[PDB]
Amino acid sequence: PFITVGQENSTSIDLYYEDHGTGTPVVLIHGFPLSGHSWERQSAALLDAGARVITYDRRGFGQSSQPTTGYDYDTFAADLNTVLETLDLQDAVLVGFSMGTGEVARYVSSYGTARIAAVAFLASLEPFLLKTDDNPDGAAPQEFFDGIVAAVKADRYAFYTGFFNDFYNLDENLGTRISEEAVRNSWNTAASGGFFAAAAAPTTWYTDFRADIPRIDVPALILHGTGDRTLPIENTARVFHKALPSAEYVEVEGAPHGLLWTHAEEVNTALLAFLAKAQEAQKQKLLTEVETYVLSIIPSGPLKAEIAQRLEDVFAGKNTDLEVLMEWLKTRPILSPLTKGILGFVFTLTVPSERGLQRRRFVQNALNGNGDPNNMDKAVKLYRKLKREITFHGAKEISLSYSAGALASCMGLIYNRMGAVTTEVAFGLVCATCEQIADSQ
Amino acid sequence: PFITVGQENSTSIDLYYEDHGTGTPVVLIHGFPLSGHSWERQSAALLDAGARVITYDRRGFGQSSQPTTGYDYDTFAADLNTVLETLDLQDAVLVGFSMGTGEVARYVSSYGTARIAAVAFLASLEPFLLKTDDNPDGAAPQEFFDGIVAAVKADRYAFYTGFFNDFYNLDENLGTRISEEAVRNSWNTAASGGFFAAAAAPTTWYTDFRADIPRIDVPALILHGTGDRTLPIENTARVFHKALPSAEYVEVEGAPHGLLWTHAEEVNTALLAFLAKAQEAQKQKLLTEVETYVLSIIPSGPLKAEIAQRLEDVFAGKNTDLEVLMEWLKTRPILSPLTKGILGFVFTLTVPSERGLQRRRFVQNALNGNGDPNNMDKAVKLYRKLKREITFHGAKEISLSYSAGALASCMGLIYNRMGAVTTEVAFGLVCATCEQIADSQ
Amino acid sequence: PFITVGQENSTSIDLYYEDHGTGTPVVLIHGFPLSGHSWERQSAALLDAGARVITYDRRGFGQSSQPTTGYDYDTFAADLNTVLETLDLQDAVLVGFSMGTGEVARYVSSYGTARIAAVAFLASLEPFLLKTDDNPDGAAPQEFFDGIVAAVKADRYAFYTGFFNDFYNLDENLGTRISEEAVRNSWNTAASGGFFAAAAAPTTWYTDFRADIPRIDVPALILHGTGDRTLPIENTARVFHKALPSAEYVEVEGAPHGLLWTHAEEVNTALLAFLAKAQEAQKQKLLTEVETYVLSIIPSGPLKAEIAQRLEDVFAGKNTDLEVLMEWLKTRPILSPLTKGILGFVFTLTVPSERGLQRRRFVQNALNGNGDPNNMDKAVKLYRKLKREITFHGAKEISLSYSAGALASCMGLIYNRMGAVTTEVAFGLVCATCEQIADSQ
Amino acid sequence: PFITVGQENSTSIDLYYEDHGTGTPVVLIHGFPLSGHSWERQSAALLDAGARVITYDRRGFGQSSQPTTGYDYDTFAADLNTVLETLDLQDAVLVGFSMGTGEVARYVSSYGTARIAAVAFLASLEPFLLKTDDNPDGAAPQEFFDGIVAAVKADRYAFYTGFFNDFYNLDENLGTRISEEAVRNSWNTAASGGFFAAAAAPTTWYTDFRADIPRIDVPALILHGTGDRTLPIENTARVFHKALPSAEYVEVEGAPHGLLWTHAEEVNTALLAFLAKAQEAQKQKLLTEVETYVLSIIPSGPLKAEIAQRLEDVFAGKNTDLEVLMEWLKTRPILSPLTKGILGFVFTLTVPSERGLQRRRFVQNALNGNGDPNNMDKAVKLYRKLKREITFHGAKEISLSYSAGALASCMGLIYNRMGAVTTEVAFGLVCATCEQIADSQ
């Protein structure tokens, strides 16, 4: 798969990307000189843990186009921007490794955290690698980087070999934490990047990210290997944490630069924990928003108390007997049959286990759009559009452009499994409906 | 409710009718001088036993119009014809009491038994009541009937009193089998019929039904009270059974003419038995027709053997574990997903108990019309028409005018309970689908 | 007259109704096994007292259709809903007797009191008749009701006789408060209801109305006969008043269940006085509703004090010399000619006697829409619609969709008697105008 | 080149495929963890032998997309279906190696053999690899496969190394039948497949193909290496042949799993001979198909004997003197000029050598559509469509939608070389014509 990010002469500039799983989106931004596939140990864990995994190959690397332009962090951040906008990612986690940590800082800094729930920096460049008068903690002098450029231009093929040596601490880790075959694959991946990008990349490494850091808005993780020969932990992660005290901070004891493979565990467990903390809060946010919309249609009173208590309990995960819940709703006075259908729908959708219970007649009758063909026609039209939605707000926005009869019919269509959409999209549908109905009062 | 059967001068002639319950249609044709409501003891039993009950008031009686024309059995049979055609009754049972038995014979005779599964004659006029040279078994001379006409014209109000006396054997049955209040209601009903019809009705009683009897095509019941003072069992039921040996024949010991009330039990039990014998055969006919259509889409082989065996068993009433059945279908090789969906649908529809099993994903996916909006649009259109159908063939006929994609989508719509139709109509839908699919091969 | 409330097989379900008089609508809902005509003593009094009287026959009774479906209070309340919506009743009083009191509670509870000014419960079922563990005050055990069903199915004709005995306390009241002929008419009415409804009705009698009662929003009357043998006052009216302390409560000393006839007097007198109170409250509400709108366009100050005092006085019924009033308005400084015209209009409309005073030039000039033909064109269009309105809010709603110039012109049209509308509709017109004008400020 | 088979989140799922040569289509389905390019030894031989070679990369392998969904044989068979339908393959040979043999069985089983002339199974999975109670001949227990999954997830890179060891019997074959460089290319190909597919593939290996085998309709070949360490010949090919006795069966003595490279020879020779047999059978079928249609228009008799003998002889390859043949036809009595033209056309088309003979006037005159412009107009329209056809039946189907005059004119157009179509398409044209003409009789 490709996303086009620009044009170079007669050719467009396309980034290779992958898009796996379902759930909260996690975007992984690889390091030099590798590709999105270098995250494969992390991707597997995130997929098992229930996240949507997005990887892409930076321009000049892996399967992306290989221009001779745009090798700088503003372009790289603009590239990332295009990806996020193209996929309409909401509530995303951005995880960068090495070079990738430059994208994370520069994007957050320039474009803000509108789509972004949390960030993570692994084997970071930050805050500035260039050793100057005003930057004493810098890791190396300018002449040092000039050196790498010269070395890559001389042979890049040979260069990759010595690079992966220190990248992986092969003198320590070969035959132990990394196989000879895994290293061979890495070299092949590097050899496959563009010649121009290979020599141009090292010039972006001493980008000054010092003014980007105060812009970091959302929860952050900083993770570094203490045996990092490529980015000395003392000039990078340790001074970065002083600049962002707020960041959660993890040192991987004796881990090299290429800790994604050698210490995938410690990485994946820690990354997993970070996702886990981010994910539950996001889920809670989703649950409570739904609740306000659902409650907005119910008349104020003690019933509205019983209903809200029940929502909150199933939302907290207390598996309730849906059969008991549904009978209660069914037999509630005052509530309109429409209202009971909406609640009926919400509860079956959110309850931990449906326990093989059949659909309820009172709900099917409540959500049938009065069996009106125009309602049903529009509901089918909305359904088509909702299949393309992946977020709560996108779903809710498109739904609000339809009449309440059509919305109720659409809900029946999903309820009865005549169509299927993602959970968060279904929430947006029922919330648009509640919004429309509440507004009629 | 009314059915218009003709015109008299500036006014139309409308028959009052009622239409209760669901299931096999049973049409009750009342006696003189009462209305459709005189069947109320029988209607209750038939409704409990699970039949569709149709009653109507003969022209000049009860709540029907009161013309001064058309008091003869050809008109009465034409009236009945209009009712049956207006309601599109298929596979109907015609039950006549007294005068009503004239309609049954004359309709069958002239119009044939196309809509008619069985007939029943209770307290029959048949075969001819007029005592002549060629009709020695006749119950009375012409002068006798001339007498009744004269008596009704003189006072009809007073006349009804002495009539209900012998009609009910009140000297035997009052305070015992019939209450004084029940008799009062009968007189009120009679007093409410038209003056002209009251005097004209008795002229139709010695209609010669002798040539109508050989036309009786379908299973018949003859039932008479041996204490019938109004229609002597010896000139009516006993000579009628000789003319139709084939008829099932029941004498109600010491039962009067008005045995529907006084002996409702013996009547309702016997009538019930007759319905019960008719109903099971009709059900078997419905089951086996469905089976041929369902089997027509399956490739010939051992699987087709296993499938047919299973249909036949559930059709015979062996409650099978639908969960077991569905898993088996689901996991069957060779069968197309479409075919599996159709069978999936049929089995859930015909199985005695669904045991609260959720709908199956493999069926929902199989019957979704490829999620195509035009299919779904037509399926919703068909659904509207099917809601108005009550028979298997009417349903199947209208369904065959739709494409297979639309038919499959309609089936999904019913499967998923987004709409509801009667069982026999649903069978017609799935059979039209099978017919269309088979024809494509 | 009929209102269609549903469909049963080939027949629609139609309710027989009557619609008499003019004025505030009062809807009377009869008891078992009688019809709308059982209210005839009450109807006459309400008609003389100047109300619009609506009666209808519950499904299965009187002249309504006699289905074998929908014998439950949600359907009965839905039936009532259809009636109220079909006639567009605003500000209605709902009066139920016996079974009818179930409709009143269930409709108010489910559909709310939007159309409803007040409610009245006569010989009530409330709050629950079934004697259970949780309902100790219940009047009878389940087996008792099962008994009535069995009795009606056995003979209903005979059944009605013993029923009217206790219904009317005939051992006390025959030849005294009820004639033998009045009782005969009652039995005839009952005998005329559907057989199925007769047996199905008693199953609805122990409906639990306990959750409906807190929903009663509007002023209520509870009225019961202390000699009620059918609904023991101790298990019904007395525990109902504890549940609704707010209700006005009247015991009719030694009155039977059928107190509508036996004690029509005591009944009419409580009903009419209570209705009168409700009417006066409605009038006061209208005065505040008209007065607030009228005052909203006047600048705050002492004049606004003089004006408000005057409105209130004419509204209270102090017949004022309109000639004096008009001269005063005419000669008032500060007030715009438009404002003076609106007040001019209001006063001539509300003053007890116009005393044959001619229309005023200052008002005609003020309400002429500037003699603009488009204003006048729209005013004539609005007028057409207002002729079809009967309520203040309906009139006001449609009026607000027109511009102020057109509204003022319409008012002139009425003022000048070039058209005519009902008083409350005229109020809605002038209030819409005031609302539009006030909003411009 | 790509064929799109589905959608995963924001990305479509595309299969990389290649399409080489001309002639009968042969579709090669690769094994794990390789791609369509692994058939290169076989492709070269098939191309030289004159076949159309189709290869594609299974989802997750080679150059195909790398989803995290659809790793099961129904999806894989659906993928294959899409390929076959997309290219409109008729009369195709399906050849599977290892994993690929699962596609062949499952597609044939579910979708039938409409497009399929013959099948071949090389180093087969069949019939079931899982060792169970009911499957005693199974090659391994479930825990064994669970093991491979775990091994791939641990390192896949390192894993491929030990895998190719046993895949190729490198301890036997390295430096001999397979070079070190050929093995290096294989590892590179594997390393290039998706991480997720690599771990998910081994779960599809113990799919039960036992119910698929009876569905195999068409001529089959089973071929296995007796030195197969990956799929023990005793649990796979040997028990498979018992299940399909009908299959032609070839053991490659001491050949490993990766016999496509190590024993390409023995492989190509069995494949080509078997293909040749299938080709000859197809040709015979075509001859009967053409010949029967051609004979259907000739009157029964001795001439029809001479004609049929001649067809059969040229069809068998006896190069006949077309000049002699044509003169004979030309001078035949009884035969219509139309019939003579059709035969004239067939013979010049099928004769081995035309020997530079000019077109015949009798044929040009016979196939000129009576020089009618509408015939000729339609014939030109048909011609356009026939240029797009590649099969006998597709050609014949489209041709039958044209009138006989237009069909004859089209044939003249081809005869006279005013247009050109492939041989089999031309056969379809002349057969449609014969069918139309025969039907007129």
Side-chain angles (χ1 to χ4, degrees), chain A residues 354 356-358 364 373 384 413 416-418, chain B residues 354 356-358 364 373 384 413 416-418:
Chain A
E354 294 179 19
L357 296 186
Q358 298 276 29
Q364 297 173 314
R384 182 197 283 99
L413 187 157
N416 290 316
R417 294 184 181 97
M418 290 206 73
Chain B
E354 294 179 19
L357 296 186
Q358 298 276 29
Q364 297 173 314
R384 182 197 283 99
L413 187 157
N416 290 316
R417 294 184 181 97
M418 290 206 73

PDB file of all heavy atoms in Angstrom, chain A residues 354 356-358 364 373 384 413 416-418, chain B residues 354 356-358 364 373 384 413 416-418:
ATOM      1  N   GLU A 354     -23.276 -11.587  25.769  1.00  0.00           N
ATOM      2  CA  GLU A 354     -24.696 -11.649  25.415  1.00  0.00           C
ATOM      3  C   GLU A 354     -25.302 -12.988  25.820  1.00  0.00           C
ATOM      4  O   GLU A 354     -26.523 -13.135  25.822  1.00  0.00           O
ATOM      5  CB  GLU A 354     -24.908 -11.417  23.920  1.00  0.00           C
ATOM      6  CG  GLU A 354     -24.540 -10.015  23.476  1.00  0.00           C
ATOM      7  CD  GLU A 354     -24.740  -9.790  21.988  1.00  0.00           C
ATOM      8  OE1 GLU A 354     -25.485 -10.563  21.338  1.00  0.00           O
ATOM      9  OE2 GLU A 354     -24.136  -8.830  21.467  1.00  0.00           O
ATOM     10  N   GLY A 356     -25.575 -15.838  24.370  1.00  0.00           N
ATOM     11  CA  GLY A 356     -26.406 -16.445  23.331  1.00  0.00           C
ATOM     12  C   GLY A 356     -27.883 -16.086  23.394  1.00  0.00           C
ATOM     13  O   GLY A 356     -28.733 -16.896  23.023  1.00  0.00           O
ATOM     14  N   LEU A 357     -28.199 -14.878  23.857  1.00  0.00           N
ATOM     15  CA  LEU A 357     -29.590 -14.432  23.922  1.00  0.00           C
ATOM     16  C   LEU A 357     -30.054 -13.968  22.557  1.00  0.00           C
ATOM     17  O   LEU A 357     -29.316 -13.286  21.848  1.00  0.00           O
ATOM     18  CB  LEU A 357     -29.760 -13.283  24.910  1.00  0.00           C
ATOM     19  CG  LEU A 357     -29.469 -13.558  26.381  1.00  0.00           C
ATOM     20  CD1 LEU A 357     -29.863 -12.323  27.165  1.00  0.00           C
ATOM     21  CD2 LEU A 357     -30.188 -14.791  26.904  1.00  0.00           C
ATOM     22  N   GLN A 358     -31.282 -14.324  22.206  1.00  0.00           N
ATOM     23  CA  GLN A 358     -31.852 -13.939  20.930  1.00  0.00           C
ATOM     24  C   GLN A 358     -32.122 -12.446  20.966  1.00  0.00           C
ATOM     25  O   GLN A 358     -32.196 -11.848  22.039  1.00  0.00           O
ATOM     26  CB  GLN A 358     -33.148 -14.693  20.677  1.00  0.00           C
ATOM     27  CG  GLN A 358     -33.013 -16.198  20.580  1.00  0.00           C
ATOM     28  CD  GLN A 358     -32.604 -16.648  19.197  1.00  0.00           C
ATOM     29  OE1 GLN A 358     -31.924 -15.928  18.451  1.00  0.00           O
ATOM     30  NE2 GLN A 358     -33.053 -17.844  18.816  1.00  0.00           N
ATOM     31  N   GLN A 364     -36.540  -4.800  18.094  1.00  0.00           N
ATOM     32  CA  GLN A 364     -36.722  -4.890  16.645  1.00  0.00           C
ATOM     33  C   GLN A 364     -37.889  -4.013  16.199  1.00  0.00           C
ATOM     34  O   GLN A 364     -37.797  -3.296  15.197  1.00  0.00           O
ATOM     35  CB  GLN A 364     -36.961  -6.335  16.229  1.00  0.00           C
ATOM     36  CG  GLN A 364     -35.774  -7.220  16.532  1.00  0.00           C
ATOM     37  CD  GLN A 364     -36.031  -8.682  16.278  1.00  0.00           C
ATOM     38  OE1 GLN A 364     -37.068  -9.233  16.673  1.00  0.00           O
ATOM     39  NE2 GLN A 364     -35.069  -9.332  15.636  1.00  0.00           N
ATOM     40  N   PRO A 373     -40.281   2.618   3.796  1.00  0.00           N
ATOM     41  CA  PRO A 373     -39.266   2.389   2.757  1.00  0.00           C
ATOM     42  C   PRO A 373     -38.275   3.545   2.514  1.00  0.00           C
ATOM     43  O   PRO A 373     -37.118   3.284   2.170  1.00  0.00           O
ATOM     44  CB  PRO A 373     -40.102   2.137   1.494  1.00  0.00           C
ATOM     45  CG  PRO A 373     -41.450   1.764   1.988  1.00  0.00           C
ATOM     46  CD  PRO A 373     -41.648   2.493   3.264  1.00  0.00           C
ATOM     47  N   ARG A 384     -23.792   2.354   4.211  1.00  0.00           N
ATOM     48  CA  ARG A 384     -22.676   2.300   3.253  1.00  0.00           C
ATOM     49  C   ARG A 384     -21.552   3.237   3.699  1.00  0.00           C
ATOM     50  O   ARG A 384     -20.381   2.853   3.729  1.00  0.00           O
ATOM     51  CB  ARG A 384     -23.118   2.656   1.818  1.00  0.00           C
ATOM     52  CG  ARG A 384     -21.988   2.574   0.788  1.00  0.00           C
ATOM     53  CD  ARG A 384     -22.317   3.299  -0.508  1.00  0.00           C
ATOM     54  NE  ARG A 384     -23.223   2.628  -1.428  1.00  0.00           N
ATOM     55  CZ  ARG A 384     -24.526   2.891  -1.540  1.00  0.00           C
ATOM     56  NH1 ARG A 384     -25.133   3.777  -0.754  1.00  0.00           N
ATOM     57  NH2 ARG A 384     -25.233   2.249  -2.444  1.00  0.00           N
ATOM     58  N   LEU A 413     -31.031  -2.059  11.570  1.00  0.00           N
ATOM     59  CA  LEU A 413     -30.278  -2.803  10.566  1.00  0.00           C
ATOM     60  C   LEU A 413     -29.017  -3.428  11.169  1.00  0.00           C
ATOM     61  O   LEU A 413     -28.677  -4.583  10.877  1.00  0.00           O
ATOM     62  CB  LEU A 413     -29.946  -1.859   9.407  1.00  0.00           C
ATOM     63  CG  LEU A 413     -29.305  -2.339   8.103  1.00  0.00           C
ATOM     64  CD1 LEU A 413     -29.639  -1.337   7.005  1.00  0.00           C
ATOM     65  CD2 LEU A 413     -27.798  -2.485   8.244  1.00  0.00           C
ATOM     66  N   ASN A 416     -30.085  -6.018  14.074  1.00  0.00           N
ATOM     67  CA  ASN A 416     -30.513  -7.279  13.487  1.00  0.00           C
ATOM     68  C   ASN A 416     -29.420  -7.990  12.683  1.00  0.00           C
ATOM     69  O   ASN A 416     -29.672  -9.030  12.069  1.00  0.00           O
ATOM     70  CB  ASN A 416     -31.754  -7.034  12.626  1.00  0.00           C
ATOM     71  CG  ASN A 416     -32.983  -6.706  13.468  1.00  0.00           C
ATOM     72  OD1 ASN A 416     -33.237  -7.348  14.477  1.00  0.00           O
ATOM     73  ND2 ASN A 416     -33.741  -5.696  13.058  1.00  0.00           N
ATOM     74  N   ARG A 417     -28.211  -7.423  12.698  1.00  0.00           N
ATOM     75  CA  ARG A 417     -27.040  -7.977  12.015  1.00  0.00           C
ATOM     76  C   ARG A 417     -27.222  -8.067  10.490  1.00  0.00           C
ATOM     77  O   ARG A 417     -26.619  -8.920   9.840  1.00  0.00           O
ATOM     78  CB  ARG A 417     -26.662  -9.353  12.589  1.00  0.00           C
ATOM     79  CG  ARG A 417     -26.174  -9.388  14.031  1.00  0.00           C
ATOM     80  CD  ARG A 417     -25.752 -10.804  14.415  1.00  0.00           C
ATOM     81  NE  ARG A 417     -25.282 -10.945  15.791  1.00  0.00           N
ATOM     82  CZ  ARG A 417     -26.022 -11.361  16.822  1.00  0.00           C
ATOM     83  NH1 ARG A 417     -27.313 -11.671  16.671  1.00  0.00           N
ATOM     84  NH2 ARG A 417     -25.468 -11.457  18.029  1.00  0.00           N
ATOM     85  N   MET A 418     -28.038  -7.183   9.920  1.00  0.00           N
ATOM     86  CA  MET A 418     -28.182  -7.117   8.470  1.00  0.00           C
ATOM     87  C   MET A 418     -27.018  -6.350   7.878  1.00  0.00           C
ATOM     88  O   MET A 418     -26.826  -6.319   6.665  1.00  0.00           O
ATOM     89  CB  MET A 418     -29.493  -6.447   8.085  1.00  0.00           C
ATOM     90  CG  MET A 418     -30.702  -7.299   8.403  1.00  0.00           C
ATOM     91  SD  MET A 418     -32.110  -6.928   7.338  1.00  0.00           S
ATOM     92  CE  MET A 418     -31.596  -7.660   5.787  1.00  0.00           C
TER      93      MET A 418
ATOM     94  N   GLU B 354     -36.209 -23.257  18.682  1.00  0.00           N
ATOM     95  CA  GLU B 354     -34.914 -22.650  18.367  1.00  0.00           C
ATOM     96  C   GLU B 354     -34.004 -22.636  19.589  1.00  0.00           C
ATOM     97  O   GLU B 354     -32.807 -22.387  19.463  1.00  0.00           O
ATOM     98  CB  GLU B 354     -35.080 -21.229  17.830  1.00  0.00           C
ATOM     99  CG  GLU B 354     -35.782 -21.176  16.488  1.00  0.00           C
ATOM    100  CD  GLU B 354     -35.957 -19.763  15.963  1.00  0.00           C
ATOM    101  OE1 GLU B 354     -35.247 -18.836  16.425  1.00  0.00           O
ATOM    102  OE2 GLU B 354     -36.822 -19.582  15.082  1.00  0.00           O
ATOM    103  N   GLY B 356     -33.551 -20.571  22.005  1.00  0.00           N
ATOM    104  CA  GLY B 356     -32.874 -19.293  22.219  1.00  0.00           C
ATOM    105  C   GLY B 356     -31.508 -19.168  21.562  1.00  0.00           C
ATOM    106  O   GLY B 356     -30.629 -18.482  22.085  1.00  0.00           O
ATOM    107  N   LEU B 357     -31.319 -19.821  20.416  1.00  0.00           N
ATOM    108  CA  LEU B 357     -30.051 -19.732  19.694  1.00  0.00           C
ATOM    109  C   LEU B 357     -29.989 -18.441  18.904  1.00  0.00           C
ATOM    110  O   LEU B 357     -30.974 -18.043  18.285  1.00  0.00           O
ATOM    111  CB  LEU B 357     -29.876 -20.901  18.731  1.00  0.00           C
ATOM    112  CG  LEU B 357     -29.782 -22.304  19.321  1.00  0.00           C
ATOM    113  CD1 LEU B 357     -29.453 -23.256  18.189  1.00  0.00           C
ATOM    114  CD2 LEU B 357     -28.757 -22.406  20.438  1.00  0.00           C
ATOM    115  N   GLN B 358     -28.824 -17.807  18.912  1.00  0.00           N
ATOM    116  CA  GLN B 358     -28.627 -16.565  18.190  1.00  0.00           C
ATOM    117  C   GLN B 358     -28.627 -16.879  16.706  1.00  0.00           C
ATOM    118  O   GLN B 358     -28.427 -18.027  16.307  1.00  0.00           O
ATOM    119  CB  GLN B 358     -27.304 -15.926  18.584  1.00  0.00           C
ATOM    120  CG  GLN B 358     -27.186 -15.527  20.040  1.00  0.00           C
ATOM    121  CD  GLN B 358     -27.802 -14.175  20.314  1.00  0.00           C
ATOM    122  OE1 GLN B 358     -28.747 -13.739  19.640  1.00  0.00           O
ATOM    123  NE2 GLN B 358     -27.241 -13.467  21.295  1.00  0.00           N
ATOM    124  N   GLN B 364     -26.388 -15.011   7.889  1.00  0.00           N
ATOM    125  CA  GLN B 364     -26.516 -13.570   7.677  1.00  0.00           C
ATOM    126  C   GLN B 364     -25.652 -13.125   6.500  1.00  0.00           C
ATOM    127  O   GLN B 364     -26.089 -12.338   5.654  1.00  0.00           O
ATOM    128  CB  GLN B 364     -26.120 -12.810   8.936  1.00  0.00           C
ATOM    129  CG  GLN B 364     -27.033 -13.119  10.100  1.00  0.00           C
ATOM    130  CD  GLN B 364     -26.581 -12.509  11.400  1.00  0.00           C
ATOM    131  OE1 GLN B 364     -25.402 -12.582  11.771  1.00  0.00           O
ATOM    132  NE2 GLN B 364     -27.529 -11.923  12.120  1.00  0.00           N
ATOM    133  N   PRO B 373     -27.270  -2.255  -2.597  1.00  0.00           N
ATOM    134  CA  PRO B 373     -28.430  -1.390  -2.340  1.00  0.00           C
ATOM    135  C   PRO B 373     -29.641  -1.588  -3.274  1.00  0.00           C
ATOM    136  O   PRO B 373     -30.779  -1.408  -2.831  1.00  0.00           O
ATOM    137  CB  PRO B 373     -27.862   0.026  -2.507  1.00  0.00           C
ATOM    138  CG  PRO B 373     -26.393  -0.125  -2.358  1.00  0.00           C
ATOM    139  CD  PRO B 373     -26.053  -1.473  -2.873  1.00  0.00           C
ATOM    140  N   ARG B 384     -42.945  -5.545   1.353  1.00  0.00           N
ATOM    141  CA  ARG B 384     -44.216  -4.814   1.479  1.00  0.00           C
ATOM    142  C   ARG B 384     -45.363  -5.648   0.907  1.00  0.00           C
ATOM    143  O   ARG B 384     -46.411  -5.802   1.538  1.00  0.00           O
ATOM    144  CB  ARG B 384     -44.171  -3.437   0.785  1.00  0.00           C
ATOM    145  CG  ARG B 384     -45.466  -2.633   0.928  1.00  0.00           C
ATOM    146  CD  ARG B 384     -45.565  -1.489  -0.071  1.00  0.00           C
ATOM    147  NE  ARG B 384     -44.778  -0.298   0.210  1.00  0.00           N
ATOM    148  CZ  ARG B 384     -43.601  -0.016  -0.349  1.00  0.00           C
ATOM    149  NH1 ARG B 384     -43.004  -0.855  -1.192  1.00  0.00           N
ATOM    150  NH2 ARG B 384     -43.006   1.119  -0.050  1.00  0.00           N
ATOM    151  N   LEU B 413     -33.596 -10.340   5.307  1.00  0.00           N
ATOM    152  CA  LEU B 413     -34.405  -9.348   6.007  1.00  0.00           C
ATOM    153  C   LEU B 413     -35.370 -10.015   6.992  1.00  0.00           C
ATOM    154  O   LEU B 413     -35.555  -9.543   8.122  1.00  0.00           O
ATOM    155  CB  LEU B 413     -35.148  -8.503   4.968  1.00  0.00           C
ATOM    156  CG  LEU B 413     -35.963  -7.262   5.337  1.00  0.00           C
ATOM    157  CD1 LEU B 413     -36.063  -6.369   4.106  1.00  0.00           C
ATOM    158  CD2 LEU B 413     -37.351  -7.635   5.833  1.00  0.00           C
ATOM    159  N   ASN B 416     -33.245 -12.043   9.759  1.00  0.00           N
ATOM    160  CA  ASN B 416     -32.737 -11.127  10.769  1.00  0.00           C
ATOM    161  C   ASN B 416     -33.836 -10.396  11.548  1.00  0.00           C
ATOM    162  O   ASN B 416     -33.543  -9.534  12.381  1.00  0.00           O
ATOM    163  CB  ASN B 416     -31.780 -10.133  10.109  1.00  0.00           C
ATOM    164  CG  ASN B 416     -30.476 -10.792   9.674  1.00  0.00           C
ATOM    165  OD1 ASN B 416     -29.896 -11.574  10.414  1.00  0.00           O
ATOM    166  ND2 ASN B 416     -30.019 -10.485   8.466  1.00  0.00           N
ATOM    167  N   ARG B 417     -35.093 -10.751  11.273  1.00  0.00           N
ATOM    168  CA  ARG B 417     -36.267 -10.183  11.939  1.00  0.00           C
ATOM    169  C   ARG B 417     -36.412  -8.668  11.714  1.00  0.00           C
ATOM    170  O   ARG B 417     -36.980  -7.966  12.549  1.00  0.00           O
ATOM    171  CB  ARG B 417     -36.258 -10.499  13.445  1.00  0.00           C
ATOM    172  CG  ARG B 417     -36.403 -11.962  13.843  1.00  0.00           C
ATOM    173  CD  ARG B 417     -36.470 -12.095  15.362  1.00  0.00           C
ATOM    174  NE  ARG B 417     -36.592 -13.469  15.846  1.00  0.00           N
ATOM    175  CZ  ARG B 417     -35.581 -14.233  16.266  1.00  0.00           C
ATOM    176  NH1 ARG B 417     -34.322 -13.790  16.253  1.00  0.00           N
ATOM    177  NH2 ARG B 417     -35.830 -15.469  16.695  1.00  0.00           N
ATOM    178  N   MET B 418     -35.912  -8.169  10.585  1.00  0.00           N
ATOM    179  CA  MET B 418     -36.104  -6.768  10.232  1.00  0.00           C
ATOM    180  C   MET B 418     -37.488  -6.576   9.647  1.00  0.00           C
ATOM    181  O   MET B 418     -37.944  -5.454   9.443  1.00  0.00           O
ATOM    182  CB  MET B 418     -35.052  -6.311   9.233  1.00  0.00           C
ATOM    183  CG  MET B 418     -33.670  -6.213   9.841  1.00  0.00           C
ATOM    184  SD  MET B 418     -32.620  -5.021   8.986  1.00  0.00           S
ATOM    185  CE  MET B 418     -33.322  -3.464   9.524  1.00  0.00           C
TER     186      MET B 418
END
